[PDB]
Design a protein around this nucleic acid. Structure first.
Lengths: 94, 129, 141, 82, 200, 83
RNA sequence: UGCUGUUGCUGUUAAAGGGUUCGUAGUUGAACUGUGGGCUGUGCAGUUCCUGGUCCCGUCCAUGUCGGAUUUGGUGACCCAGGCCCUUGCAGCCCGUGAACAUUCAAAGAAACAAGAAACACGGGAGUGGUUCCU
RNA sequence: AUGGGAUAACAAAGGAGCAGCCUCUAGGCUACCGUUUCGGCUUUUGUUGGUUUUAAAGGUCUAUUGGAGAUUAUGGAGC
């Protein structure tokens, strides 16, 4: 449900994340990515390769519950993000 | 919304004297409620207090001896110059003999008779006959 | 009586007269102060921190053991939340009701319960600016 | 017969906690011993949370509304007030 | 200087008193490892004064003042010191009272708002009960206001503790008066919760 | 026990009785207004010389605290035994 | 004419509570920093010592269970009492207190110190103060 | 204008959004203000103008003399 929505706040004031699908593929290529959050309206062939780098790099995708606009406000920012990657978690447990 | 903590205090004493109770238990004690009561106690209209600690605001338990006819609070607390004891004596007290008007003065809470002699005036608090 | 709406119900914790910690607490103040902060780095509020202590760890009152309430302990360690928590949980209700009403526009009951909740926020936000604990330009949106 | 300032046992056992002359608590800490491991954790009377043993994590009580239910014959020992 | 003179305040190291020496020694012996667990808090500790007070009945009281800085020490140990300071001194009761300044009432509305509450009289004099009475608690207070005009405090200890402290209270009642110049009278009460003054 | 003249002459018309419970004056027109005279006793259980009499005001009988009030008085007087 | 009502009106049915709720100007707003002491003489109220007028103990009876008496009874209980400054409170009077606590003791708290103090301490002016004041 | 300080009002605060330990002596170094360019400067040396030294002062660096402390450093923390 929204049980994740609480963890993105802690990552936000703790840990390291990067926003956007093209800057979140570099965290996979480097194997620095500890989580992958993807929106609903993320276009399919973008969702598909993001999910594919996550099978090669064994990182744990979480398909989010809402829009890129809502994904984006969860991490309380005024813009939109269809893909979020957590470089390191916080005291938020994954 | 307890606006005046004497208003609440002296009503209870008043309205539990009209019922003949032997004791009253008064909800929010305060530095003024005590000093008022200790003036009642000086002239014989109340026996004893207990001021109980709740750690917050006490609870006064007053032993009534049956001798109070009324206890007011005058809410806005009008002033008295020492020439104005005759208004309050006239309006709020039954006779020019036995009533008492309680004031706050520079010197403290005291009767209108303790005030005439010390010459202070002050602000009115209440009465008791 | 009650701020908005009419209940008069009265239910509250009634704190004890005796403020010395029990004899059976062997936990030093500095070991409490560190629990508070340790669990505030888990993204918890104080109103909950104080529970996990009385529930599991048996600390009834942190003022009575630690010298001090659960927020000086946070404010001193820089772990204190950015918005007071009474204000955070109202904004959090109002926004969900705003998200509720966005599909359901004939639901009049929660259109009125907003009108209440928002009018609270603006009273707290008026307190916490006056008291200087919010930036004086703080606004609902 | 009665004093207001020194009330009988029978009157004030009845009263609400706020309506007492004192304002006291209705709650107490119990000393609970997990059944699964022999270990002892203090547990608050009205728990309002999942409370677990430390060694084994057993969920030693239910949150239930008024007064928490301890689990399955776990030993309670009621702690003093002080 | 002498090894046990570092248990005093430095002004009184030079010219102590026949009283001030004899606890200094005793604090030192217990500083020196003898009592387990007071090997733990011997060494950082000091005494300012001690005073001999004679209640009007039976046994004198040595009132040992130490600086407030040491409360959280002594509250751990206070049951041990007094017990084992009395063995060292037979026939007199040993009380431990931290020393506290009291700001006079300011009279300026603008000064009242600046006063440390812990330096105010009502806060001070309370801690001078808790010092005389410790480890036991004040369960209740009441101020009995009598037709004479007299107001008298009543401080209600636990009944669980009746057995230890009963014997000390006529002194603790009196010493408190000499320190504060206020008066106190004690009674005990059992369920402290439901408030019932013990008679039995 | 009444208002005296400056010359010391007692000026009252009469001095009314006071309820021993409520301490209220008993008025001429008050027709509950009871006296209850309990015969004072001495060892061997014979009546002699009994002055102790209770006065209750009209108010109090009609609510039915007369009984409760006469328990309180006879106990302060020692005419009764708490147990 | 208390039929304009601050003192001082009325509002269920006579004239009069907005249909409900939110709410600004405005009015109102909880408790707390706080019984100063001691000494003397004198007015009040609540443990030495003396009473034997009680209940308790006990005795004699025994009376199936509603007699009783019994002396010493019994530091028991209790009591009515005493110009006990031994009591505590309290009224009034004198009068001392750096007067909580600590701290100083030199010629009488001086100096330091604690507290207070801008009506103050800290330096300074002869064109200051009736010719630069007092000891 | 000046006493009184009970009741009140104004203003400030919002509690890590803080916060001065005092003291005897010795040494070392050190202008002091001011700035746009040459400016300013404390008595005494008989007096005024010019120069200059020494000295205190303050500051700053080091040195330890006595005592505090309203919060235990011989203490907490980690190896």
């Amino acid at each position: 449900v929204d049980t994740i929505n609480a963890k993105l706040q802690l990552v936000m004031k703790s840990g390291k994340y990067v926003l956007g699908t093209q800057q979140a593929l570099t965290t996979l290529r480097q194997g620095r990515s500890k989580l992958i959050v993807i929106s609903n309206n993320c276009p399919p062939i973008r969702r598909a390769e993001v999910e594919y780098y996550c099978t090669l790099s064994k990182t744990p995708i979480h398909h989010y519950s809402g829009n890129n606009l809502d994904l984006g406000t969860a991490c309380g920012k005024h813009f939109r993000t269809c893909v979020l990657s957590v470089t390191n978690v916080g005291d938020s447990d994954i | 919304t307890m606006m005046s903590v004497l208003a609440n205090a002296l009503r209870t004493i008043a309205s539990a004297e009209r019922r003949g109770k032997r004791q009253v238990l008064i909800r929010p004690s305060s530095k003024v409620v005590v000093k008022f009561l200790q003036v009642m106690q000086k002239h014989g209209y109340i026996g004893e207090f207990e001021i109980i600690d709740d750690h917050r605001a006490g609870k006064i338990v007053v032993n009534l001896n049956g001798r109070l006819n009324k206890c007011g609070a005058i809410c806005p607390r009008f002033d008295c110059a020492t020439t104005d004891y005759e208004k309050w004596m006239k309006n709020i007290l039954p006779s020019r003999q036995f009533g008492f008007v309680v004031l706050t003065t520079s010197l403290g809470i005291m009767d209108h008779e303790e005030a005439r002699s010390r010459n202070t005036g002050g602000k009115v608090l209440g009465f008791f006959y | 009586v009650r701020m908005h709406g009419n209940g008069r119900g009265k239910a509250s914790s009634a704190l004890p007269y005796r403020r010395t910690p029990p004899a059976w607490l062997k936990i030093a103040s500095r070991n409490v102060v560190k629990m508070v902060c340790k669990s505030s780095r888990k993204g918890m509020m104080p109103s909950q921190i104080g529970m996990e202590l009385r529930d599991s760890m048996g600390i009834a009152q942190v003022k009575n053991v630690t010298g001090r309430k659960i927020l000086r302990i946070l404010k001193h360690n820089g772990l204190a939340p950015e918005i007071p928590e009474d204000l955070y949980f109202l904004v959090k209700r109002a926004t969900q009701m705003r998200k509720h009403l966005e599909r359901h526009t004939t639901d009049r009951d929660t259109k009125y319960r907003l009108i209440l909740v928002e009018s609270r926020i603006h009273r707290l936000a008026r307190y916490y600016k006056r008291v200087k604990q919010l930036p004086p330009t703080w606004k609902y949106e | 017969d009665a004093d207001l300032s020194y009330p009988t046992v029978r009157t004030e056992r009845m009263k609400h906690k706020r309506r007492r002359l004192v304002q006291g608590p209705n709650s107490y800490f119990m000393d609970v011993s997990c059944p699964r491991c022999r270990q002892v954790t203090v547990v608050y009377s009205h728990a309002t949370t999942a409370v677990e043993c430390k060694g084994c994590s057993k969920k030693l009580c239910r949150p239930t509304g008024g007064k928490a239910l301890l689990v399955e014959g776990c030993g309670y020992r009621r702690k003093p007030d002080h | 200087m002498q090894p046990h003179l570092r248990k005093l305040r430095k002004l009184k190291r030079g010219k102590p008193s026949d009283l001030e020496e004899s606890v200094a020694k005793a604090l030192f012996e217990l500083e020196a490892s003898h009592k387990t667990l007071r090997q733990e808090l011997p060494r950082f500790h000091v005494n300012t004064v001690r005073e001999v007070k004679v209640p009007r009945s039976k046994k004198t009281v040595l009132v040992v003042f130490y600086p407030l800085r040491f409360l959280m020490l002594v509250r751990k140990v206070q049951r041990a010191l007094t017990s084992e300071l009395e063995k060292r001194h037979p026939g007199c009761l040993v009380m431990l009272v931290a020393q506290r300044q009291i700001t006079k009432r300011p009279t300026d509305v603008y000064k009242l708002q600046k006063v440390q509450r812990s330096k105010t009289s009502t806060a001070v004099f309370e801690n001078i009960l808790n010092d005389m009475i410790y480890p036991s608690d004040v369960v209740g207070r009441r101020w009995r206001c009598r037709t004479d005009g007299s107001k008298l405090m009543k401080v209600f200890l636990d009944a669980r503790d009746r057995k230890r402290i009963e014997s000390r209270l006529r002194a603790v009642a009196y010493v408190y008066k000499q320190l504060t110049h206020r008066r106190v009278s004690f009674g005990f009460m059992w369920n402290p919760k439901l408030q019932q003054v013990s008679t039995r | 026990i009444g208002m005296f003249n400056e010359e010391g002459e007692n000026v009252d018309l009469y001095i009314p009785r006071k309820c021993h419970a409520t301490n209220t004056l008993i008025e001429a027109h008050d027709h509950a207004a009871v006296q209850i005279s309990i015969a004072n006793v001495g060892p061997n259980g014979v009546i002699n010389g009994t002055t102790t009499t209770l006065c209750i005001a009209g108010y109090l009988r009609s609510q039915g605290e007369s009984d409760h009030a006469i328990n309180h008085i006879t106990i302060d007087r020692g005419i009764m035994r708490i147990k």
